[PDB]
Amino acid sequence: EDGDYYRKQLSPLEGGGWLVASGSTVAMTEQLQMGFGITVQYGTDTNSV
Amino acid sequence: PAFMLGSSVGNFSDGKMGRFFNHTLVLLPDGCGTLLRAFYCILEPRSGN
Amino acid sequence: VDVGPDSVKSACIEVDIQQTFFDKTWPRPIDVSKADGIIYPQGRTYSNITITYQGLFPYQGDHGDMYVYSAGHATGT
């Protein structure tokens, strides 16, 4: 649900403290919409895709 | 040598350091050094002696 | 998910701590002129030329984190 608050604990060596966050939601329509992200790489390996 | 890789650290049930969480990369040589077994999977502690 | 054969009874055998014996000095600093532990360029190569390159490398001559393993306790066979 919207306004949800989440949290978790942290190990002592990483500086202590508790990690906290808040989340929000968007409802569905009849048809589902999604997001795509394209990134291409040139010199990592042999040019082969 | 056999390696463990992870982004989350912690202490064990008796507080001993070495406990990790969530997905973890495990490297294990085997086959008298001929094989290089590896997996990015979930490790779960055992509750025995 | 993948195929993994399952384990047996969960009595883990006894484990010691003898790091005092493990404390031995075999320091081997790395020699860049000897060119050991030197990454290659990821996708290209050259031949018979000197070239400056920016990337990932170790410092010259570090003592590092030399650890070892050894056999356990044994009484004959």
Ligand SMILES: *[C@@H]1O[C@H](CO)[C@@H](O[C@@H]2O[C@H](CO)[C@@H](O)[C@H](O)[C@H]2NC(C)=O)[C@H](O)[C@H]1NC(C)=O
């Ligand atoms: C690699 O390149 C070097 C120089 O860039 C070449 O070395 C020269 O070789 C000639 C012929 O043997 C000599 O007359 C020069 O004095 C050398 N120059 C030096 C040593 O600076 C070398 O021959 C090349 N290697 C190959 C296989 O062609």
Ligand SMILES: *[C@@H]1O[C@H](CO)[C@@H](O)[C@H](O)[C@H]1NC(C)=O
């Ligand atoms: C060895 O382990 C892998 C991964 O758990 C498994 O896929 C394979 O079947 C095992 N082989 C034998 C002989 O148990």
